[PDB]
Design a binder for these strands. Structure first.
Ligand code: DTP
Ligand code: CA
Ligand code: CA
Length: 1105
DNA sequence: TAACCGCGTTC
DNA sequence: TCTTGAACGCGGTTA
């Protein structure tokens, strides 16, 4: 049956792979000893593994196996196949009768079963597993994965009535072979992952394919250089509209192959033959493009296809190729009578992405979305090239794409080529090293390593460890459709996450003094701890000993005297040191310190830790719940009766009906409560999980430290050596990229235990990680409060100021002449966290043969310092007593922007006016020589921006006004999925649809460019919202919609200037100028620097005193 | 006024 | 199907 298609597909894939240079290599037969240490002697072919896919194979029903795609040492390529029987396990609730269920499944599954076997694995949910006791399991093996699925289909009936009550007719009678099946296990492992794990094969490693299997050649390590292609397609476009692969044609396709550029053009659209040209944005990105002017598109497609066949690419990179370019070329190939999969072996898959068997499709957009660590407002190719490649790509407005086909083809070709350059070199210097290296530890191919969620990446890593330690995988987690608490249905339940505080606002600068009030008892405490904390820094922070340090006492006495000056003069007006302290990999290091794992949470090996639980429940109670349901049982349903509907479909009707009843009587739709819960953490459980976290943390620390090394080397580089300065700066962005790309995967080991379908779910374990972190950040803040003035706090980071005279940086001197770095403000914190948050109960197996553990003290929680900074600027809220958190600006000593966070300037969309405003104002806080002077200097910029708005934009030209006044906002789903909701995006989506057709809203992720109107008057802002595109429409079209939209049937004036509700914009900017300058200025004792923006009444009253 | 939502950041 | 988490700002509706 269904095998038919699979066997057919393989023959196809086999022929296309053969066409592209991968043909099955069957290694010679060897009757000599199979050790890895004789690899040179064993006959076989050595190659670099670049790809792997599951296949069926008819012998030399189909047989399951994995094709492996190799690049050989001699410049060629080949594939080799590994067969491996797929398998899962049957768990038994009576291990004395495994025999009987064994003989039962043997008969019952005769149709699909191949072989059967009794095994044993470690089960962390079984008592006495730490003493060597193991769970007995039946290993069912199959010829192919269809047979495996078939057995699952036959077992679940048994699995599902065993859960249901058995019906015994002889009521007067007080166990069957089928009821002994408790569960099946490891039944949902992707086959190629299973082969990849059980066989320890990884893409990116070198092997020698031999008769007895694959032998890793540890003597190579350096990756082979594959043939890499990257392409961009530019197409024709209806004015003010989206390209349609049904109507529109490809104008031109630009690509690059191992550094050499090319360019196809359809002369029917392009209207001019083009000639070889060069686009080399920077020396390190050479771009010589040869051009292939073609007559009809059909020839453009054939020529693109032809090349590919000649080049034999193993990697094809694009930029959003999965959802536009690849599909587009498909529809056009179909329309023009070409089958692309016969032409180049590419075709869409189940999720609609485009893959091939031999060549990986490397969509840079997927990397950027997951691993670039950039905001989504910075993930467009223009901005990515600036951040990561250090140059400005060529910018051409999409509306002018289609006409510039004729007016200036050569210009449009330059832009086409600019997209290709940026895509190839973005892939080659960021994606390709990261993904292929990742494959050497993660059992996926490049295509999957690029696209899988970071949680799944964590899961893959964890499954390797669990298998290699012979640990049985738990089945995927299943959230209950209904959960309750004190008789109330739970809308949602979670834990209290990170702790965040805004404590101050305003301007803080290295040349502008502040008041400090130092707690004298704080100085006493530090001095009591100074000797042991200094030893701590040397012994633990720098892994040395007090014996080889020679200036210990001077540094001590130096520190001691500065501290003593601060104890007497506790009231001081000094220049500040703007510092930031942040725990390195906080949550991971908290899990490793406390030996935290989902499997360590139990109900002395026991380390009791607290977390905070938070639930959201209906104030309704069981009585109300029981009633509403019966009501619902009586309605007829669209399709039916309520009981007829799926349990899920039932409860979702219930939830919508509960929200209404509770509001009527309870009057509150939901109730929030925080319960503190204590969980047991067994300090002796098999540590395979946390060890995986430990390993991946250390993997990241590798790159974070190299970033820090080269950030130091650039300081040593002399200003004149531009090449050196440039390379180091290039190394810094390289390692910052690599270390950030690991950060998300790393922290996903913490997320994973709350993820849906998690094989290792524990709400407790995540809760305890968060609450511990809240305790550590707050004890740190308590001390800096007593000795300085903290500014913002966020989970693990503290921005604070300190008196210039607070002990700062000191350098120990060693017997070796070497020096040890010491930041006193850092090590004073690090000593107290290590004295109050150390796990003295950490246990590990010392002797596995007799199960002897040693108990022990662990702690890897360290603050790290960056600073001192030149300026920090915190906004304040418009509301009394409140602050803005997760938003601020920081500046380095040289005047460069250190960090900008949270602000609209960084986010995607937002109103461009506030973007450009923020872009201009922040840097201005560096001027003036007094705080009052500084606010003045920024006030000048504010009034200038206030001027353009009070002038009703008569001040700057039209094409420049549309940008400043537009607000772009993306829309997660299609508008059809938003009804019952009102927003400026939702309106702009309808009006785009009405005027430009329903096609506009068919695809989600729409980006709604809108200005809001003055009319209708007193109408809600959501309703007075106009797509920008209308103002580029023909005058009759504009008038009809605008008058309709403004609700004035007689409006003749059709100028953007008249319609704009400049009032909205002034309020918006004012709130901006208010929170960033005016209100903050007051909290710093400065009378309103922008008097045209009025204060709030509460501030006026406190200003009034 | 306060609760609640979608989006997109900071952790 | 496949799928890391919680805390937060902001403009906007809604009770
Ligand atoms: N994307 C994320 N997913 C899950 N947890 C996260 C994420 N980002 C941050 N966290 C959590 C876990 C981190 O330990 C904690 C502190 O945030 P942050 O300081 O940005 O990261 P970090 O402390 O792990 O790395 P770093 O060494 O760069 O400080 O916040
Ligand atoms: Ca393009
Ligand atoms: Ca951190």
């Amino acid at each position: 049956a269904l095998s038919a298609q699979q066997l057919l597909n393989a023959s196809k894939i086999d022929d296309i792979d053969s066409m592209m240079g991968f043909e099955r290599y069957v290694p010679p037969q060897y009757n000599g000893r199979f050790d890895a240490k004789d690899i040179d002697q064993i006959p076989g072919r050595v190659g670099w593994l670049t790809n792997m896919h599951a296949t069926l194979v008819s012998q030399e029903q189909g047989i399951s196996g994995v094709d492996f795609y190799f690049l050989d040492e001699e410049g060629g390529s080949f594939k080799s196949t590994v067969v491996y029987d797929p398998y899962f396990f049957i768990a038994c609730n009576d291990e004395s009768r495994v025999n009987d269920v064994e003989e039962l499944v043997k008969k019952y599954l005769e149709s699909c079963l191949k072989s059967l076997q009794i095994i044993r694995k470690e089960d962390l949910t079984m008592d006495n597993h730490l003493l060597g006791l193991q769970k007995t399991l039946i290993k069912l093996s199959f010829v192919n994965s269809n047979q495996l699925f078939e057995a699952r289909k036959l077992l679940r009936p048994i699995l599902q009535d065993n859960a249901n009550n058995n019906v015994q007719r002889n009521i007067y009678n007080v166990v069957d072979a089928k009821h002994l099946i408790e569960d099946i296990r490891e039944y949902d492992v992707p086959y190629h992952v299973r082969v990849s794990i059980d066989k320890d094969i990884r893409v990116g490693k070198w092997y020698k394919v031999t008769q007895q299997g694959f032998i890793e050649d540890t003597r190579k390590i350096a990756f082979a250089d594959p043939v890499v292609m990257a392409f961009d397609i530019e197409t024709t476009k209806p004015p003010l509209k989206f390209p349609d692969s049904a109507v529109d044609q490809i104008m031109m396709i630009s690509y690059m192959i191992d550094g050499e550029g090319f360019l196809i053009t359809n002369r029917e659209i392009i209207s001019e033959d083009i000639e070889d040209f060069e686009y080399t944005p920077k020396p390190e990105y050479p771009g010589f493009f040869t051009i292939f002017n073609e007559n009809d598109e059909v020839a453009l497609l054939q020529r693109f296809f032809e090349h590919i066949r000649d080049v034999r690419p193993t990697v094809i990179s694009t930029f959003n190729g999965d959802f536009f370019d690849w599909p587009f070329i498909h529809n056009r190939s179909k329309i023009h009578g070409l089958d692309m999969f016969d032409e180049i072996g590419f075709a869409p898959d189940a999720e609609g992405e485009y893959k091939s068997s031999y060549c990986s499709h490397m969509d840079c957009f997927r990397w950027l979305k997951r691993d670039s660590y950039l905001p989504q407002g910075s993930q467009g190719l223009k901005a990515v090239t600036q951040s990561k490649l250090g140059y400005n790509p060529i910018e051409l407005d999409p509306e002018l794409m289609t006409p510039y086909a004729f007016e200036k083809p050569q210009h449009l070709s330059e832009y086409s080529v600019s997209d290709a350059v940026a895509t190839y070199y973005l892939y080659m210097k960021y994606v390709h090293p990261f993904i292929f290296s990742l494959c050497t530890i993660i059992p996926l191919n490049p295509d999957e390593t690029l696209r899988k969620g970071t949680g799944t990446l964590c899961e893959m890593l964890l499954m390797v460890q669990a298998y290699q330690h012979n640990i049985l995988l738990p089945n995927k987690h299943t959230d209950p459709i209904e959960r309750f608490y004190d008789g109330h249905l739970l809308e949602s339940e979670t834990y209290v996450g990170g702790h965040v505080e805004s404590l101050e606002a305003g301007v803080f600068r290295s040349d502008l003094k502040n008041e400090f009030k130092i707690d004298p008892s704080a100085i006493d405490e530090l001095l009591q701890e100074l000797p042991e904390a200094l030893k701590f820094s040397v012994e633990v922070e720098n892994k040395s000993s007090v014996d080889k340090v020679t200036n210990f006492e001077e540094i001590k006495n130096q520190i001691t005297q500065k501290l003593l000056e601060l104890k007497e003069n506790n009231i001081r007006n000094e220049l500040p040191l703007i510092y930031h302290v942040d725990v390195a990999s906080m949550y991971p290091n908290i899990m490793t310190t406390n030996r935290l794992q989902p499997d360590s949470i139990k109900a002395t090996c026991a380390r009791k830790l607290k977390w905070a639980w938070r639930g959201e429940f209906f104030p309704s109670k069981m009585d109300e719940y029981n009633m509403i349901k019966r009501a619902l049982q009586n309605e007829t349903f669209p399709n039916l009766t309520f009981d007829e509907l799926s349990y899920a479909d039932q409860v979702i009707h219930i939830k919508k009906r509960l929200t209404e009843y509770s509001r009527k009587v309870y009057h509150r739709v939901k109730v929030s409560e925080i319960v503190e819960r204590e969980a047991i953490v067994c300090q002796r459980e098999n540590p395979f999980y946390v060890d995986t976290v430990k390993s991946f943390r250390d993997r990241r620390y590798e790159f974070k430290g190299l970033a820090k090394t080269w950030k130091g080397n650039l300081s040593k580089i002399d200003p004149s050596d531009k090449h050196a300065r440039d390379e180091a700066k290039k190394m810094i962005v390289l390692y910052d990229s690599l270390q950030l790309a690991h950060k998300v995967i790393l922290n996903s080991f913490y997320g994973y235990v709350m993820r849906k379908g998690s094989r290792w779910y524990s709400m407790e374990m995540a809760g305890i990680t968060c609450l511990t972190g809240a305790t550590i950040i707050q004890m740190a803040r308590a001390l800096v409060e007593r000795v300085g003035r903290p500014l913002e706090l966020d989970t693990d980071g503290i921005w604070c100021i300190l008196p210039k005279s607070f002990p700062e940086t000191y350098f120990f001197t060693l017997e070796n002449g070497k020096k040890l770095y010491l930041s006193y403000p850092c090590s004073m914190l690090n000593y107290r966290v290590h004295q109050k948050f150390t796990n003295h109960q950490y246990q590990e197996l010392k002797d596995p043969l007799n199960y002897i553990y040693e108990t022990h003290s662990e702690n890897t929680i360290f603050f790290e310092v960056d600073g001192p900074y030149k300026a920090m600027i915190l906004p304040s809220s418009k509301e009394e007593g409140k602050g803005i958190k997760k938003r601020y600006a920081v500046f380095n000593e040289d005047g460069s922007l250190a960090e900008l966070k949270g602000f609209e300037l960084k986010r995607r969309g937002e109103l461009q006016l506030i973007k450009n405003f923020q872009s201009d104002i922040f840097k201005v806080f560096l001027e003036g020589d007094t705080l009052e002077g500084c606010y003045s200097a920024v006030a000048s910029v504010c009034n200038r921006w206030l001027d353009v708005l009070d002038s009703h934009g008569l001040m700057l030209e039209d094409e420049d006004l549309v940008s400043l006044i537009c607000e772009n906002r993306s829309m997660s789903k299609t508008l059809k999925e938003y009804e019952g909701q009102k927003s400026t995006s939702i309106t702009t989506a309808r009006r785009l649809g009405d005027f430009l057709g329903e096609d506009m809203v068919k695809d989600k992720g729409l980006q709604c460019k809108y200005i809001i109107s003055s009319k209708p008057f007193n109408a809600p802002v959501t309703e007075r919202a106009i797509p920008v595109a209308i103002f580029s429409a023909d005058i009759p079209i504009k008038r009809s919609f605008l008058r309709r939209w403004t609700l004035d049937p007689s409006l003749e004036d059709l100028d953007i200037r008249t319609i704009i509700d400049w009032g909205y914009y002034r309020e918006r900017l004012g709130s901006a100028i208010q929170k960033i300058i005016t209100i903050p200025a007051a909290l710093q004792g400065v009378s309103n620097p922008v008097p045209r923006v009025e204060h709030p009444d509460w501030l006026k009253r406190k200003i009034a005193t």
